[PDB]
């Protein structure tokens, strides 16, 4: 989540005074080249390096990835609501997530580098196979980075992290 190890260099700048989504590139700053859904969306030659996705009210979404002098980094699936990606469904106040890769092993979930969906002592957070259920989803509390991984593997080894921002 917070870590970029695993080529997860794309993270969201949550230091915005206005409801704008700024994306940051953790590459050797020489020139950051930004891509969106595989297609390049920008090339920052020195100076600025953050990518503005616009206001969060426009629900920015897509698999965003950058590149400095090295090869492309792992994508960051942005999903605002104000390679197979993670599936997001909203029904009233319930947020349900579907793991993109569910080979049938025990799928574990982590929220801002914090495991979730494991304990049954939480009525509003359920894990059903490749489906993680978040009832009464808290915009200010339950938004952030999310990742799914099988038992035995490292979350940083996941193909990409998901950045969730939803107003319910």
């Amino acid at each position: 989540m917070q870590s970029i190890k695993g080529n997860h260099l794309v993270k969201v700048y949550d230091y915005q005074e206005d409801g704008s989504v700024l994306l940051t590139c953790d590459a050797e700053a020489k020139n950051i080249t930004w891509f969106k859904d595989g297609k390049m969306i920008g090339f920052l030659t020195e100076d600025k390096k953050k990518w503005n996705l616009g206001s969060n009210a426009k629900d920015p979404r897509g698999m965003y990835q950058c590149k400095g002098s090295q090869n492309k980094s792992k994508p960051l699936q942005v999903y605002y609501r104000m390679q197979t990606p993670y599936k997001v469904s909203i029904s009233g106040t319930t947020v349900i997530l579907t793991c993109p890769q569910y080979p049938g092993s025990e799928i574990l979930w982590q929220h801002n580098d914090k495991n979730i969906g494991g304990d049954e002592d939480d009525k509003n957070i359920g894990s059903d196979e490749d489906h993680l259920s978040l009832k009464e989803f808290s915009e200010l509390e339950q938004s952030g980075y999310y990742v799914c991984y099988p038992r035995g593997s490292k979350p940083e080894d996941a193909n990409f992290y998901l950045y969730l921002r939803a107003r319910v």
Epitope: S105, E106, L108, G118, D119, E120, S127, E129, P150, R151, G152, S153, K154, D157
Partner: single-chain antibody, 467 residues
Framework: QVQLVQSGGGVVQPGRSLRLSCKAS????????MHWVRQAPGKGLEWIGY????????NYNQKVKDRFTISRDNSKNTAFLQMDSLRPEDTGVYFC????????????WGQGTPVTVSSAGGGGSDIVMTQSPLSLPVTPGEPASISCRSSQNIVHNNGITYLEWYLQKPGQSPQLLIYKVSDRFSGVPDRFSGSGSGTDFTLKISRVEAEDVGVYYCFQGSHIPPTFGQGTKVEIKQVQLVQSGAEVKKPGASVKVSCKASGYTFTSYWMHWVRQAPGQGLEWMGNIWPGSGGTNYAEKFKNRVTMTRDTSISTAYMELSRLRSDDTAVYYCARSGGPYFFDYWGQGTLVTVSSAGGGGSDIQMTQSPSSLSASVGDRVTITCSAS?????MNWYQQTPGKAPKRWIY???KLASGVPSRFSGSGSGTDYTFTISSLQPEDIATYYC?????????FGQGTKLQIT
């Protein structure tokens, strides 16, 4: 002290079903995943799978994915391992282990339970109905004679030698031919005859036409389990019970092949349901007196088949759950008779079930050397090579007669109580285990294990001895 207790092992005949229990103590049973590992005599550690007690989510090794069912009871802190259709290959010590996800390792291992899969009495289990000729081809109009010998005396307490020789024409349901050892089925032309006594019996076909062509299969009768013999395929040198339609299911699944019945009171003739493996003979599977729902299951499937019936709709269902690769057979559903078993038969419902690669790569670990003798104080280095990059490697110590013990975790971290003279190193597909100073107490077998992907793969084990 965390404790894993394996129970339920023992000796069972091949093909039987076995249920094991692993009681967990010293920790919250639901917070760590439970895995079962089998240690066969002379082989290294084999991962079978895991089940999450908090979620009930289970994963299995493909080699047993279709015959074993992993169960657990959170109320009893016990995990249940239901093993069915056991083969001699399943013989060995079965171990249960606790997975600490934090170290990505099985840190607690149970002492294991020995399982031995061998038949106490094959003849008692199945009165071997060997038939003398096999696929004898016969020119038309010839005095054919097919002999079969029963591994024991087929002479029942009633004294009737309840024998037959039921014929299945190519692509057709089995039909009975000789009502008992030498009588004739109504409608069976007298051209067929037969004779026998004690354990040796034989059938005579004085005149042979195109009609006689097919396989004649000798079923036994005095022994409790009907048991069909090898089968002599003769070659050249109303009440109708409708079966259901051909189905293909996937390994571990279940098929309910139906059997609709008309022309007889369905609850007045026991609807025993034979099975005919491709490339193998018939084997009685179970019966059900449609009147009362009684089941008399056969031993080979004793914990996998379930035969129910709806006398209402005059159809008999038979749901074979946890289907396995060799289960593919056509469940000819016959109506078990008065003086002749398996009288009139249904169309037959073939059910071919097949599996895919199921992680065939099963990315392998190779350990070297397989056995090592070194002097006390000598430096011993053990290498473990992975067929693919594994993120972390673990080292486990198994003293002969003792369960594997976690020794090195995260490819360099020594388990609690592990002396510092042991050291693990490596990355990707190469790992090394180094014992800086050999001690006599270090005599044991060392196995390397990868967890990057299911199933957990273990190195063959390095036998360390002191010269």
């Amino acid at each position: 002290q965390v404790q894993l207790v394996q129970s339920g092992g023992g000796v069972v005949q091949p093909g039987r079903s076995l249920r094991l229990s692993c009681k967990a103590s010293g920790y919250t049973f639901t917070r760590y995943t439970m895995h079962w590992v089998r240690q066969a005599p002379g082989k290294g550690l084999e991962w079978i799978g895991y089940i999450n007690p908090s979620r009930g989510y289970t994963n299995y090794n493909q080699k047993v994915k279709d015959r074993f069912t992993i169960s657990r009871d959170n109320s009893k802190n016990t995990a249940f391992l239901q093993m069915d259709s056991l083969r001699p290959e399943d013989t060995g010590v079965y171990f249960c282990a606790r997975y600490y996800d934090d170290h990505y390792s099985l840190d607690y291992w149970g002492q294991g339970t020995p399982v031995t899969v061998s038949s106490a009495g094959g003849g008692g289990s199945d009165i071997v109905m060997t038939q003398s000729p096999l696929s004898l081809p016969v020119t038309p109009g010839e005095p054919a004679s097919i002999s079969c010998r029963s591994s024991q005396n087929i002479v029942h307490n009633n004294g009737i030698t309840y024998l037959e020789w039921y014929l299945q024409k190519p692509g057709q349901s089995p039909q009975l031919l000789i009502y008992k050892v030498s009588d004739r089925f109504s409608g069976v032309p007298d051209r067929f005859s037969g004779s026998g006594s004690g354990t040796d019996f034989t059938l005579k076909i004085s005149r042979v036409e195109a009609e006689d062509v097919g396989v004649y299969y000798c079923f036994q009768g005095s022994h409790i389990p009907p048991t069909f013999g090898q089968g002599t395929k003769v070659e050249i040198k109303q009440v109708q019970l409708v079966q259901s339609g051909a189905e293909v299911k996937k390994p571990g699944a279940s098929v309910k092949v139906s059997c609709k019945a008309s022309g007889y009171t369905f609850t007045s003739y026991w609807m025993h349901w034979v099975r005919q493996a491709p490339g193998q003979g018939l084997e009685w599977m179970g019966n059900i007196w449609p009147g009362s729902g009684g089941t008399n299951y056969a031993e080979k499937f004793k914990n996998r088949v379930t035969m129910t019936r709806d006398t209402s709709i005059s159809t008999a269902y038979m749901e074979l759950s946890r289907l396995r690769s060799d289960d593919t057979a056509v469940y000819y559903c016959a109506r078990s008779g008065g003086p002749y078993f398996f009288d009139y038969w249904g169309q037959g419902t073939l059910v071919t079930v097949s599996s895919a690669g199921g992680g065939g790569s099963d990315i392998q670990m190779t350990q070297s050397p397989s056995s090592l003798s070194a002097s006390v104080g000598d430096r011993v280095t053990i290498t473990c090579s992975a067929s693919s990059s594994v993120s972390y490697m673990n080292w486990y110590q198994q003293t002969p007669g003792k369960a594997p013990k976690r020794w090195i975790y995260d490819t360099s971290k020594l388990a609690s109580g592990v002396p510092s003279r042991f050291s693990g190193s490596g990355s990707g597909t190469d790992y090394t285990f180094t014992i800086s100073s050999l001690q006599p107490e270090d005599i044991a077998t060392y196995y390397c294990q990868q967890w990057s992907s299911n199933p957990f793969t273990f190195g063959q084990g390095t036998k360390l001895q002191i010269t």
